[PDB]
Amino acid sequence: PYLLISTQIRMEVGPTMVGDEQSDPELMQHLGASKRRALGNNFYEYYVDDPPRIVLDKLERRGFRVLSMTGVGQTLVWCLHKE
Amino acid sequence: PYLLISTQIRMEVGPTMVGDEQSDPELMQHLGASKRRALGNNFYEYYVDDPPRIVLDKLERRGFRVLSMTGVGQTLVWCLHKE
Amino acid sequence: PYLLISTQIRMEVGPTMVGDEQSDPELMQHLGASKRRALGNNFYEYYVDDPPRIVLDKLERRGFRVLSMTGVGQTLVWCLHKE
Amino acid sequence: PYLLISTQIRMEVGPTMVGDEQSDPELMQHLGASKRRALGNNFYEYYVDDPPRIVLDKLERRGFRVLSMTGVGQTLVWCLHKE
Amino acid sequence: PYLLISTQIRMEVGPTMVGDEQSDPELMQHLGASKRRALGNNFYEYYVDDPPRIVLDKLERRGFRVLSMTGVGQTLVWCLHKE
Ligand SMILES: N[C@@H](Cc1ccccc1)C(=O)O
Ligand SMILES: N[C@@H](Cc1ccccc1)C(=O)O
Ligand SMILES: N[C@@H](Cc1ccccc1)C(=O)O
Ligand SMILES: N[C@@H](Cc1ccccc1)C(=O)O
Ligand SMILES: N[C@@H](Cc1ccccc1)C(=O)O
Ligand SMILES: [K+]
Ligand SMILES: [K+]
Ligand SMILES: [K+]
Ligand SMILES: [K+]
Ligand SMILES: [K+]
């Protein structure tokens, strides 16, 4: 149902974080996401190389819509929901 | 009827703050929230170990909808409303 | 019709700013607000000791709805509208 | 059809910026706005002394609705859209 | 389709960034956008000289509506969606 995606520093370029370790594996696979650990983090996260505009387009085809977009520090976050 | 939840530094990992001293004890119990008074604070707060995506999903099953999401400092906040 | 409320540093505790000098005196009285002139300011504002979640609940009973919530600096602001 | 208004430092006091060089002159006149090229700026801007709550009320009477409110630096911005 | 546009420092003046390398070439041509690789960037971006209010008006004529507006660092971002 709810989904959070994000990008840092610039909105025109990836990586875009598209999930946490408990994310839907089917949706992560559909987006072409990989599990990667950022340096100075103990847990893996899902990410794609695509900029966020492309991820939003792909999520819409899976029935997700944007409820909110916000900036926090140097991170741009989108909150999406499936009916 | 209104609910404020938040997480700091990273959106994919908890803790997620889910209430203040005057929060609904039953809803706090339903979420599995722990009550605590953080270091140097003169008030209590409820929190869960879950990342905020999981808390948003649980709140929807209780009739809460996301009205807004915003960043402030290093905190990502959601404002929810019950039907 | 429009109303702006805010809180600083933490969302769980007040004070909550609920009005400027030209605010509706009856609504300020209904909320239990007091006037205060902050240090170095040439204007007074209305505030309550309650955390913002409690103010939002009171404002809903007066016909106000949340249109937006945003963070700016260390301030969390809500924009409300009456129909 | 789109309108951007803003205020800095505090939401309770003006000035409120209500337009750029290409704004509707009649709407600027209706709001009682003045032109003022500011220090460190090349462009002109329209502004009023009123706090933003009063400008939002006046804009509603002209058919504008608030679509979004956000913070950026020390600026609080509203994005409005005509019906 | 989703669209992300942005401006920095001041909302009244351009440039307005209107696309990434994979943006719709026809829409970029319609807006009169140019490609520009910023200092020390590994990618190109599309931009126009117009302030964002004018770009929002042009995008509405192409069927785009503003879903959200947010501040992140010194950047004001709009998230748009076509019907
Ligand atoms: N730590 C991130 C901001 C952030 C906070 C909370 C959740 C998500 C992201 C930054 O400085 O860019
Ligand atoms: N103090 C929080 C920001 C904040 C302000 C107001 C209310 C809630 C949170 C931070 O720096 O992360
Ligand atoms: N001055 C406030 C931010 C703010 C800006 C504009 C309007 C309202 C509040 C702070 O630093 O917390
Ligand atoms: N420069 C503004 C922030 C801002 C950025 C982009 C557009 C509008 C305003 C400030 O520091 O308050
Ligand atoms: N780097 C931008 C903020 C930003 C972060 C993420 C995406 C887009 C923009 C700034 O400091 O103004
Ligand atoms: K990025
Ligand atoms: K966290
Ligand atoms: K507070
Ligand atoms: K101000
Ligand atoms: K600009």
Numbering used by the authors:
A (entry chain C), B (entry chain H), C (entry chain F), D (entry chain J), E (entry chain A): 1 to 83
Authors' own words:
Guanosine triphosphate (GTP) cyclohydrolase I (GCH1) (EC:3.5.4.16) catalyzes the conversion of GTP to dihydroneopterin triphosphate (H2NTP). This reaction is the first and rate-limiting step involved in the de novo synthesis of tetrahydrobiopterin (BH4). The effects of GFRP on GCH1 occur via formation of heteromeric protein complexes between GCH1 and GFRP, which are dependent on the intracellular concentrations of the effector molecules phenylalanine or BH4. GCH1−GFRP complexes consist of one GCH1 decamer flanked by two pentameric GFRP complexes.
GFRP occurs as a pentamer of 50 kDa (5 × 10 kDa). The X-ray structures of stimulatory and inhibitory rat GCH1−GFRP complexes show that phenylalanine binds to a surface pocket on GFRP close to the protein−protein interaction interface with GCH1, whereas BH4 binds to an allosteric pocket on GCH1 close to the GFRP interface.
